[PDB]
Amino acid sequence: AELATRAIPELTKLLNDEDQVVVNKAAVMVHQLSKKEASRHAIMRSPQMVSAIVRTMQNTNDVETARCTAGTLHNLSHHREGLLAIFKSGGIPALVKMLGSPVDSVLFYAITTLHNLLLHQEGAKMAVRLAGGLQKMVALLNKTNVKFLAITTDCLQILAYGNQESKLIILASGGPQALVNIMRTYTYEKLLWTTSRVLKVLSVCSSNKPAIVEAGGMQALGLHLTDPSQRLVQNCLWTLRNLSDAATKQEGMEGLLGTLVQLLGSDDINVVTCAAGILSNLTCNNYKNKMMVCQVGGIEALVRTVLRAGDREDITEPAICALRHLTSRHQEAEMAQNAVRLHYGLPVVVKLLHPPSHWPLIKATVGLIRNLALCPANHAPLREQGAIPRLVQLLVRAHQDTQRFVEGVRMEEIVEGCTGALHILARDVHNRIVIRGLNTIPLFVQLLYSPIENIQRVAAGVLCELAQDKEAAEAIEAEGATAPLTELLHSRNEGVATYAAAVLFRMS
Numbered sequence: 464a465e466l467a468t469r470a471i472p473e474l475t476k477l478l479n480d481e482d483q484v485v486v487n488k489a490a491v492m493v494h495q496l497s498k499k500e501a502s503r504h505a506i507m508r509s510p511q512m513v514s515a516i517v518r519t520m521q522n523t524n525d526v527e528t529a530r531c532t533a534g535t536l537h538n539l540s541h542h543r544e545g546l547l548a549i550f551k552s553g554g555i556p557a558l559v560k561m562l563g564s565p566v567d568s569v570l571f572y573a574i575t576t577l578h579n580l581l582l583h584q585e586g587a588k589m590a591v592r593l594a595g596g597l598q599k600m601v602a603l604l605n606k607t608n609v610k611f612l613a614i615t616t617d618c619l620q621i622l623a624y625g626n627q628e629s630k631l632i633i634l635a636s637g638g639p640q641a642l643v644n645i646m647r648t649y650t651y652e653k654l655l656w657t658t659s660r661v662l663k664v665l666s667v668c669s670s671n672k673p674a675i676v677e678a679g680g681m682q683a684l685g686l687h688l689t690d691p692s693q694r695l696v697q698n699c700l701w702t703l704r705n706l707s708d709a710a711t712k713q714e715g716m717e718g719l720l721g722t723l724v725q726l727l728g729s730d731d732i733n734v735v736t737c738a739a740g741i742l743s744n745l746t747c748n749n750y751k752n753k754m755m756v757c758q759v760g761g762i763e764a765l766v767r768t769v770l771r772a773g774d775r776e777d778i779t780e781p782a783i784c785a786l787r788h789l790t791s792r793h794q795e796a797e798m799a800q801n802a803v804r805l806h807y808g809l810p811v812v813v814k815l816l817h818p819p820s821h822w823p824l825i826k827a828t829v830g831l832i833r834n835l836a837l838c839p840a841n842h843a844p845l846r847e848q849g850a851i852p853r854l855v856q857l858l859v860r861a862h863q864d865t866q867r868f869v870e871g872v873r874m875e876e877i878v879e880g881c882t883g884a885l886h887i888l889a890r891d892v893h894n895r896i897v898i899r900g901l902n903t904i905p906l907f908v909q910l911l912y913s914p915i916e917n918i919q920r921v922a923a924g925v926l927c928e929l930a931q932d933k934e935a936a937e938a939i940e941a942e943g944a945t946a947p948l949t950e951l952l953h954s955r956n957e958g959v960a961t962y963a964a965a966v967l968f969r970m971s
Contacts, residue, residue: 467505471512474505478515486519487528494531497538506535507542510551517552526566533561533572540576546584555580555590562599570603571611578614581621588622597622597629601636604644609651616645616657623664630668639665639674646683652692659684659698666705673709681710685719688726700726700737707744716745720755727764727782736777739768743785753793762789762799766808769815776824779815783827790834800838809841813848816857822870822877829854829880833887842891851888851897854881862906875915882910882921889928899929904938911947911963916956923951923962930969940970 478493480486493516496502506512520532536554539545549555554576561573577596580587591597596618603615619638623629633639642665645658662680665671684699703719710716723745726738742761745752756762765782772778786808789799803809812835815828832850835841845851858881861874885903888894907929910922926944929935944966951963 464501464505467501468508470502471505471509474502475509475511475515478512478519480519486523487525490516490519490523490528490531490535493535497531497535503535503538503542503545507539507545507548510548513539513545513548513554514552517549517554517557520554521557521560526569529561529564529569530566530572533558533569533576536576537572540579543583546580546587549576549580550584550587550590555587555596556594559591559594559596559599562596562603567606567608567611570606571608574600574603574611574614574618578618581618588626591618591622592626592629597632598636601633601638601641604638604641609649609654612645612649613651613654613657616642616654616661620657620661620664623661627668630665630671633661633665634668634671634674639671639680640678643675643678643680643683647679647686652690652695655687655690656692656695656698659687659695659702663698663702663705666702672706676706676709676713679713681706681713681719682715685716685722688719688722693731697731697733697737700734700741704737704740704744707741710745711748714751716752717755720745720752720761721759724756724759724761724764727768732775732778735768735772736781739765739778739781739785743781743788746785746788750793753789754795756785757789757793757795757799757802762786762802763806765789766803766806766811769808770811774819776821779820780824780827783812783815783824783831787827787831787834790831791837796834797838800835801840803835804838804841804844809835809844809848813845813850813853816850816853822872825857826872826876826880829857829877829884833880833884836884836887836890839891842888842894845888846891846894846897851885851894852901854884854888855898855901855903857881858885858903859906862909875913875918878910878913879915879918879921882907882918882925886921886925886928889925892932895929895932895935898925899932899935899938904929904935904942908939908942908944908947911944911951916954916959919951919954920956920958920962923948923959923966927962927965927969930966936966936969936971939966945970 478489480489516532516535520529523529558573558577561569600615600619623633642658642662684703687695687699690696723738723742726734729735746756765786768782769779790796812831815824861877864874885898889898907922907926910918913919926939930939948963948967951959954960
């Protein structure tokens with residue numbers, strides 16, 4: 464402090480210059496005063512010099528002058544008050560101006576001083592947003608030095624988190640495409656981890672997610688699922704899960720789907736839950752993805768996941784959902800329906816219909832059972848496992864709650880799913896004796912009166928399979944169903960009209 468606090472008032476003049484080349488010789492001096500801790504603890508001390516360093520750094524059109532001036536601000540950026548000094552000096556907009564400067568060295572001090580400001584200075588995020596640094600940071604994502612890219616992506620992450628307007632600016636600045644490029648072309652873990660944190664923050668925005676998917680983000684995140692760094696894989700999995708609902712059109716997912724299946728066998732419950740969630744979303748409405756997941760043993764892996772998960776519905780509900788997807792509208796679905804049985808899946812699926820399972824899990828499980836029932840080799844084991852009495856009790860109770868949303872599930876979807884499962888199970892003659900013995904024919908006739916056209920179709924279809932037996936056909940008639948079936952014959956839904964025509968013919 465000798466040649467410091469006391470060296471401050473001279474430095475002031477040992478700083479401010481009006482010439483051109485003179486300040487220059489002063490700035491390279493102030494850099495030397497920045498390299499010594501004693502003299503920079505004096506630069507931090509009085510705010511006059513700090514405003515002059517910031518001013519002349521804006522004024523200078525010489526690269527060397529701008530470097531020592533920024534390196535000074537960098538050395539002040541290690542001090543807590545140095546931050547407060549740059550805040551008073553208004554350097555944040557000045558530092559932003561150099562995010563477009565070309566020489567690398569000045570970019571590296573500026574993005575670091577802004578970084579330390581965003582971490583330890585209050586209100587710094589608001590100042591960088593006002594200065595338009597967000598758009599300048601996204602443009603900097605094309606540079607090549609990984610240590611510089613790791614700081615810039617962190618600045619964007621601190622700014623975008625919790626701020627929807629900052630996310631929309633990153634979108635408008637082409638951020639999604641730039642961040643995805645960083646994930647495809649670099650191997651440095653610190654940068655890849657930070658970039659995935661940015662994409663994770665952008666993944667929850669309704670506007671950013673389609674663009675990230677469009678840029679190939681699903682495939683880019685897939686490349687790092689095999690990385691030994693847990694924080695990198697986990698953030699990639701969290702990001703993949705948020706975008707997976709918008710990636711049903713993407714192709715080239717063969718590698719991702721194969722890695723996702725292996726991740727199901729993982730011991731990390733967060734890894735397993737995410738992989739089950741991504742696979743469930745990507746297998747929806749995508750016959751090619753259904754084929755690939757089945758081609759890498761995905762049914763066997765999912766059945767093992769549901770068995771290992773037990774009572775945790777964070778794992779079973781997506782894994783059941785994915786299983787219901789892989790068992791319908793898809794080429795090797797008949798082999799997938801058998802595969803569930805072959806891997807001892809039928810007992811655990813029926814179990815998930817009983818408590819303590821919550822309604823969303825029950826919805827997927829009933830849907831899974833309809834698809835498994837399409838395979839005749841599953842008719843007898845599904846009956847032996849007690850599926851028919853339980854589906855009937857769920858249907859009866861759900862129908863009373865409709866006459867008089869639970870867990871986000873409308874009971875009319877329980878009514879429809881349970882009647883649909885019984886419709887396919889009723890193809891087997893022994894299931895029809897069980898369904899008939901439960902005195903379900905009444906309820907099925909009531910469902911013909913239901914307003915939902917899908918509930919009318921499953922109700923008429925199950926009565927149609929039942930009406931092929933003589934004893935049952937008389938019971939449907941005695942139930943008075945001949946009259947609703949007449950109004951059903953003239954329905955906008957074909958399926959409602961044809962099933963009603965079949966039962967009517969079976970009653971003779």
